[PDB]
Each structure stands twice: as C-alpha cells, then as structure tokens.
Design a protein around this ligand. Structure first.
Ligand SMILES: NC(=[NH2+])c1cccc(/C=N/N/C(N)=[NH+]/N=C/c2cccc(C(N)=[NH2+])c2)c1
Lengths: 271, 77, 290
C-alpha cells in the first residue's frame, strides 16, 4: 502493499521480498520539489517469518540499520519484544527544529494462524479488482463490518490466493493484507484512526480472522485523544481484559523519542 | 550475520514447515512546511511521481483512490 | 552479488551459530538463577561453586560467610549465593556463558530445581559493530542460554546503538493457585559510565545485600535486592551520582508480580519497560549528563 500519500507525509507498506528502502532517494526528491523538508522518518517491520529469503539490505537488521544510517545518520534502531519470537524492528530519525503539536495515531496488527473456514474465501483462480466478486468476499468473511459503507474502499483478490484492501474516509485510512496459506497463515491490519479505545476496532478485526496469535503495536502522540487518555491512567483498548480468549505473553512500553511512546503486546490464544 | 538477526532466525526456524512473506515493511516520511511549500504539499504531485517511486522497488500500481486529504494506491509485486 | 544456497536448517542453536555465524564492547555481565524452593545455605559448597567458575576462567581469591549470604570473589567476578538465588556479576573478558551449563548441572546434582534464570549484559557499543567481537560472543551466549532454556527468550531494552541492556530470561515459575512460589523480589541496578578497582558487598539484613563493582574508561556497577531500597530508589542513586559523578547512567528496577522520571543534572536519553507474561516488569532508563 500500500502507498498512502497525504498532504504532509508518505506511508509505504510492502510485503514479500520487495526492497522497500530503494525508494528513499525519490521520496526525498518528492519532498524537495514541493519545497518541503524531511523532519521525521520511521522504518518498521514485524520480524520476518523467513528472514533467509529477504534480499538487499533486508537480509539482516544490521544491513537495514547500516543502509538507513547511510541516509539518516542520527537515526536510532530499536527492537521491541522477544528477539527469537514475535517482535518489531524500528529505525527512527527526527530533525524537529520547530516544536509542533503531535496528535496523530497509528494502530498496527499482525495476525498468524488464520481461521480455516475463512481462508477459503481468500482463494481465487483469477485476478479480481474491486467489483461485485470482492463484495461477496467482504460479506462472506466479515470485512464489511470493518470497512462499512462510510469508507471509500478498493481491494484486490489475488491468484491463486492473497487479498488486499485499502479504505479511506476523510483524512483517516485503513488497510488489510491477507496471506491465507495454511502453513504460513498471516493477516495484517493498520489504521490511523483517532479513537479513545481501540478494543472495538481490534475485536472487529479479530472476529474476521480469530488468529492463534497476534501482536498489536500502538504509537501514542502526546497531543492526541488516545495520548491524553493514556497519560491519565485511562484504558486505550489493548489491555488483556478486552481479550478473554487470549493470553498476553509479553508487552513492551518505550518512549523512543521525548514525548512520544509506543506500546506493543503479543497475544496467544488459550487452549 | 549479526547475533541479533541470528536469534531472530532461530525463532523462525523453530516455526518453519516445508511460503510467502506476510509480515510487511513500513516506511513513513513526514515533511516540514516552510514559507515556500506548495499549499497542497505532497498532493501537488501527479500519479506520475508516485509511479516512478514504486518502480524503484520493482512493483506497480493496480488501482487508485483519492480524496481531499489522501491518495491511496494498491500495489503488487 | 548474492546467490541462493540450498542448505539444511540447523537442528540446534549450536549448529546455527557455527554454521550461519576490537574486543567485547560490553561493560558487565550478570547471570542469575532462582529456585522453585529455597536452598539450605550450606548444601552447595564453596568448592562446588568455585569449580563451576573455573569453567569460565575464574579462580577463587576470597570468600566470606554471613547470615543468609555466601560471597565469592574472583579476579573479575563477584558471586552472591542466598537461599533464593545465585547471582554472579563479572567483567566482559569473562566468558560467563561457559558457566551456565556447569552451574545448572551443580543445581541438578543437589536436586535443586531452577524455575527462573537471567543472563544480562550492559553494552555501550552496538552489537552491529563488525570490527568488534561483541556479536560473536553474544551468539555463543545465546547458544548456551537457549540450549539450556529452550523456553527462555532474549530481549534488548533501549537503543541498540546507545546504552542498552541485552538480557535473556527463562521463566518456568509454577503459578498454579496451589503453588507456594511467591514473587516479591526487589532488584535495583545502577550502572555509571565514565566515573571520576574493587568488588564489595555490604549486608544490612539476612539474605539482603548491596554489591558494588568498580572496574574499567572507569565505570561503577551497583546492585541491591533490599526491600528497604525499593521504597526510596531516589535517595540511593543520588548518593551514587555524587560519589562517582558519571557522564551517563543506566537504571534497572524490578517490579515483581507481587509489587526514574528525572535525575539531578541528567537528561533522559531513553525510558522503557518490559512487562513479562509472568506479571513482573523490568523498568529501564538511560541518562546523560546535561
Ligand atoms: N498487496 C500485496 N502486495 C499483497 C498483500 C497480501 C498478500 C499478498 C500475497 N499474495 N500471494 C500469496 N498470499 N501467496 N502466493 C501465491 C503464489 C503462488 C504461486 C505463484 C505465485 C506467483 N505469482 N509467482 C504466487 C500480496
């Protein structure tokens, strides 16, 4: 995958073995043409399920670090969570010379071991852009509830399997990407929606997939709605109480840069 | 390879079973606005600009949707 | 300029290291075992603990016996042994991971069940500095630790390219309602980089201690498990910063299952927490002199 272009930023999401970092020079150029100045760059990815197949700088976190350091020398890498299990790698660069107001939001989900009754609908022997066929898939699986009529959506059913969808509503966006193969079942969800509590958003996604395990990472800005709630002892929708069928295995909290926080939680389904 | 990536590999090996890479890479760039910044920001560019960006990573756009705040593109290898 | 090499998956962590894998940049290593049941202070002898540390290249030089504590001092390491835990802290030239398996065998020979263990190193440099051996050592440390505790996991608290703690935690604590394994431990660690040589232990209560190691770029390392320390971390750190006056500081505070905002003249570099599934939390913050 997805490319979200906004007034003040770009968000490029890719999967497979695509060498994402190759497009940094052109993004920098795209900012200089309109007379902008890069102030904030983040590179992030859930740990790869098959790291030995990644190419270019992505074959190791040291290579991703060195590559990003060659362009953003002051950036800093982080690893959140168990390194030999579910975790996130983050590289963060910032050149904020003029203090501003940070009220954005970011909610990402990674899900594995998807419902077997659902994976049936993510298969297809032909390529299908957004049309009547995909509408059947969205209703047959439950994506219609996550992406209701108030969103502008456009999806793609892959051949032989694979599903992607992008949704937008005003300045907010929503994206999902599904890999339904039984032996490597995976699904992803991301959104920048403002919400005082993500439980219903998250549970809505879990109802579709009902995964064996999943991770949720939440970037909290100081001046956002969820930010004020989090910094006042309030629940934000990722606490264990909202997932009785799941057991929290590990959780991390990091102020990666002053005033900005990130929360990650790994959930494993109970027996 | 480095020890940290070595640990991450062993965790993936223990979950391996003889395979597409679902987990994604995410890049985000936010720019500052100056006096001479285009009033439309990055939205001033046409789809020509963003298509050349996707070419750098050896992908292509399959569909497009835009509104008054955001341009959305679906990509495929 | 790469090609694909169809090869076998290593069947063990040791095969992965040898096949797919300046001096060590860390400042201190720390190895800890906790027991499913408290251990008679005297059942494990000083001789047996010393033979374990011989596997890591350390020779016993001094040892003292106190109420609920046995202290063993080596050339580059300090070992504390109480009824609830064994904790050894050493310089980075000590291959402390070589004592993991022998130490576990010793516990095994005494019918002592280890249900929680940790291996921790405090680094100033990044493990991705290829001119250094830090990465090769950490890979060997991981081999021994993961080989002994397949259920354990490694973690990296803090910026990988700045002051941070890499630690490995195995949690096999039996938490069945009918279990008598309570978790109200205190652990507070203060690492002080570039201060302005000794290994000391001070005991104020039975089974509770304060240890201080000073070594080398001079650095001092303070640890305590005293319940009284958990009520006033602010006071003790200020006394340490005054006596040592370091450039950078790294704090670690344990919040056990049964239960740091600003330092004088120091700016916060990083702040974070690792909440383990077992309910306990490890809090960490790094600081740099203003
Ligand atoms: N938007 C995206 N970039 C995206 C999002 C989510 C999943 C996928 C992958 N689909 N493909 C999957 N899940 N499995 N592999 C299918 C396959 C099998 C044999 C051959 C080929 C091929 N075209 N070479 C693909 C792609």
């Amino acid at each position: 995958x997805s490319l979200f272009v906004m007034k003040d930023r770009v968000i490029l999401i890719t999967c497979g073995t695509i060498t994402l970092l190759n497009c940094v020079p052109l993004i920098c150029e795209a900012v200089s043409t309109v007379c902008g100045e890069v102030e904030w760059v983040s590179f992030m990815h859930k740990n790869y399920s098959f790291p030995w197949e990644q190419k270019g700088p992505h074959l190791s976190m040291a290579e991703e670090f060195k590559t990003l350091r060659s362009h953003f020398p002051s950036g800093q890498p982080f690893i959140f969570g168990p390194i030999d299990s579910d975790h996130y790698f983050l590289y963060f660069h910032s050149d904020v010379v003029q203090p501003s107001c940070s009220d954005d939001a970011q909610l990402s989900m990674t899900m594995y071991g998807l419902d077997r009754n659902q994976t049936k609908h993510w298969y297809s022997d032909k390529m299908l852009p957004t049309g009547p066929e995909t509408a059947v898939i969205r209703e047959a699986t439950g994506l219609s509830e996550v992406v209701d009529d108030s969103w502008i959506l456009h999806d793609l059913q892959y051949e032989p399997c694979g599903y992607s969808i992008n949704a937008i509503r005003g300045s907010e966006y929503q994206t999902i990407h599904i890999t339904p193969e039984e032996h490597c079942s995976f699904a992803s969800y991301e959104t920048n929606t403002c919400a005082l509590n993500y439980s219903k958003c998250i549970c809505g996604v879990l109802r579709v997939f009902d995964p064996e395990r999943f991770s949720v990472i939440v970037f909290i800005d100081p001046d956002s709605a969820v930010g004020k709630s989090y910094h006042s002892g309030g629940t934000i929708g990722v606490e264990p109480e909202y997932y009785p069928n799941y057991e929290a295995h590990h959780r991390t909290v990091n102020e990666y840069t002053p005033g900005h926080w990130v929360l990650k939680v790994n959930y494993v389904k109970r027996a | 390879k480095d020890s940290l990536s070595l640990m991450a590999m062993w965790g993936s090996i223990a979950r391996f079973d003889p395979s597409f890479e679902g987990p994604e890479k995410r890049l985000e760039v936010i720019m500052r606005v100056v006096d001479g910044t285009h009033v439309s920001g990055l939205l001033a560019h046409d789809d020509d600009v963003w298509q050349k960006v996707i070419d750098a990573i050896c992908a292509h756009i399959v569909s497009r949707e835009f509104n008054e705040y955001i341009r959305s593109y679906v990509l495929s290898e | 300029t790469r090609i694909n090499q169809q090869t076998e998956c290593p069947s063990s962590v040791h095969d992965l290291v040898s096949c797919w894998g300046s001096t060590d940049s860390g400042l201190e290593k720390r190895f800890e075992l906790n027991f499913a049941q408290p251990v008679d202070i005297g059942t494990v002898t000083v001789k047996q603990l010393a033979s374990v540390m011989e596997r890591a290249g350390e020779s016993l030089r001094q040892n003292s016996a106190e109420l609920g504590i046995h202290t063993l001092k080596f050339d580059r390491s300090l070992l504390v042994f109480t009824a609830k835990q064994i904790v050894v802290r050493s310089s980075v030239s000590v291959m402390l991971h070589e004592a993991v398996h022998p130490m576990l065998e010793l516990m095994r020979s005494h019918n002592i069940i280890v249900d929680w263990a940790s291996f921790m190193r405090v680094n100033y440099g990044s493990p991705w500095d290829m001119t250094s051996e830090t990465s090769d050592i950490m890979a060997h440390e991981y081999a021994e630790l993961k080989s002994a505790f397949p259920t354990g996991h490694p973690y990296l608290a803090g910026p990988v390219d700045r002051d941070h703690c890499f630690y490995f935690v195995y949690d096999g604590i039996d938490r069945d309602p009918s279990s008598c394994r309570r978790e109200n431990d205190v652990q507070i660690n203060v690492y002080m980089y570039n201060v302005q040589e000794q290994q000391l232990l001070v005991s104020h209560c039975a089974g509770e201690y304060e240890t201080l190691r000073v070594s080398t770029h001079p650095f001092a390392s303070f640890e305590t498990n005293a319940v009284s320390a958990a009520s006033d971390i602010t006071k003790i750190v200020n006394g340490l910063l005054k006596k040592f006056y370091p450039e950078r500081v790294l704090l670690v505070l344990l919040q056990d299952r049964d239960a740091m905002d600003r330092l004088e003249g120091f700016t916060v570099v990083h702040r974070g927490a690792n909440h383990f599934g077992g309910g306990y939390v490890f809090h960490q913050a790094t600081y740099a002199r203003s």
